[PDB]
Amino acid sequence: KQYIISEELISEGKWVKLEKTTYMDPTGKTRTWESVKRTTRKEQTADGVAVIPVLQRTLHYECIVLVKQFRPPMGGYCIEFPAGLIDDGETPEAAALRELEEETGYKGDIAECSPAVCMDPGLSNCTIHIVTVTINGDDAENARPKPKPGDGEFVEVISLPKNDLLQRLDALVAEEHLTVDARVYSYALALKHA
Amino acid sequence: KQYIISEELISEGKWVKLEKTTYMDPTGKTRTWESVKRTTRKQTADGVAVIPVLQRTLHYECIVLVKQFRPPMGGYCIEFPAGLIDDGETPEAAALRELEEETGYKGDIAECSPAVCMDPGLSNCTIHIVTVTINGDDAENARPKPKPGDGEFVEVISLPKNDLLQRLDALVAEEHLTVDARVYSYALALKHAN
Ligand SMILES: Fc1cnc2[nH]ccc2c1
Ligand SMILES: Fc1cnc2[nH]ccc2c1
Ligand SMILES: [Cl-]
Ligand SMILES: [Mg+2]
Ligand SMILES: [Mg+2]
Ligand SMILES: [Mg+2]
Ligand SMILES: [Mg+2]
């Protein structure tokens, strides 16, 4: 029923644009929306990847590997899945494995790759692939893993037991000023609910 | 170690603003970020998202999701029922209200998250994730009357919790829909718990 009529640029930065979207509602009436988009999306099937990194080690419980970073939009530290934009010509799986190694030092193995999923569809067109990666914590390559942060990247690694992830995130929130990412929190909720 | 120095307003619309954020990186170097904010927060968070567990005896538990045209995506998205919290509203109250407006279901609070970020590399947008059970056997949830607001057009989609990820992958495959990242993340953890 509904579809886009026009997209009028309002403001274009180096990294983000604001657009006036005109669309048809299902009563057949024209309406508008203020839509955010990134300037960085070329041919990619999504803007970015988030990595669900499952650290597996003999005689350890499986951990989920998370990163803590200062996020200027938030004015604060945030706990998120390892994540980055897809380079032009890069696959989602390549991007995921590269961002995981850059942000954590860990060398993962692809397990699965989502279709493009929407970050905040009432605000932005922004999409990711959610890529599940296993990390063989028994491999010597993954022994004392060194982050390789790019210019202006500063990442802390936090590995939390999958079997207690939600209470471990609650304990971190209830111990300092920091926001858990909605996707990390949804994943931790589902681990409890299953 | 890192913090906000100042925010420059680049562009304000009715619903969304684009800010140039100046921040101190940990090296002591000043850096700039293009940051999206809503104009609507007063508020624990911008929004609530409801994980509604529809419980009917002798049936599979279902997760209640909504399909909506999302102008920023230029297409239909599958999402947790969700909306912005009114000035003076509690996150819990917004949750039960948005759930009835969007689904017609009347539900009970199980748990409420702290504020979680939607896309902290882009925006300051946060939500409370609110887990709600729906007694599908109660008369008030027999023929649920969804009460949409002005310009809302929401289709209800109940999916079995125990097969959620395969069911969502199927809708994507054969309906060209975008699944929301928090829905997909929840659906992944339901599978990864085992
Ligand atoms: F009616 C509107 C139009 N554009 C928007 N962008 C974010 C919320 C919103 C509501
Ligand atoms: F380096 C930057 C600066 N501002 C940004 N806004 C979104 C991504 C990004 C990267
Ligand atoms: Cl529940
Ligand atoms: Mg990153
Ligand atoms: Mg990165
Ligand atoms: Mg809504
Ligand atoms: Mg609503």
From Swiss-Prot, chain B:
Widely expressed. Most abundant in liver. Phosphorylation at Thr-32 is required for homodimer stability; dephosphorylation results in destabilization of the homodimer. Dephosphorylation at Thr-32 promotes the ATP-synthesis activity. Mg(2+) 1 binds at A82, E102. Binds 3 Mg(2+) ions per subunit. InterPro entries: Nudix_hydrolase, NUDIX_hydrolase-like_dom_sf, NUDIX_hydrolase_CS, NUDIX_hydrolase_dom. Its EC number is 3.6.1.13, 3.6.1.58, 2.7.7.96. PROSITE patterns: NUDIX, NUDIX_BOX. A motif (Nudix box) lies at residues 83-104. Changing E102Q: Reduces catalytic rate 2000-fold. The modification Phosphotyrosine is found at Y60. It catalyses: D-ribose 5-phosphate + ATP + H(+) = ADP-D-ribose + diphosphate; ADP-D-ribose + H2O = D-ribose 5-phosphate + AMP + 2 H(+); 8-oxo-dGDP + H2O = 8-oxo-dGMP + phosphate + H(+). Its cofactor is Mg(2+). Changing R38Q: Reduces affinity for substrate about 15-fold and reduces catalytic rate about 17-fold. Changing L84A: Reduces affinity for substrate about 6-fold. Induction: Overexpressed in cancer patients with a poor outcome. GO terms for cellular component: cytosol; extracellular exosome; nucleus. Changing W33A: Reduces affinity for substrate about 6-fold. Strongly reduced catalytic activity and strongly reduced affinity for substrate. Enzyme that can either act as an ADP-sugar pyrophosphatase in absence of diphosphate or catalyze the synthesis of ATP in presence of diphosphate. In absence of diphosphate, hydrolyzes with similar activities various modified nucleoside diphosphates such as ADP-ribose, ADP-mannose, ADP-glucose, 8-oxo-GDP and 8-oxo-dGDP. Can also hydrolyze other nucleotide sugars with low activity. In presence of diphosphate, mediates the synthesis of ATP in the nucleus by catalyzing the conversion of ADP-ribose to ATP and ribose 5-phosphate. Nuclear ATP synthesis takes place when dephosphorylated at Thr-32. Homodimer. Interacts with PARG. PANTHER family: ADP-SUGAR PYROPHOSPHATASE, UDP/ADP-SUGAR PYROPHOSPHATASE. This is ADP-sugar pyrophosphatase. The gene is NUDT5.
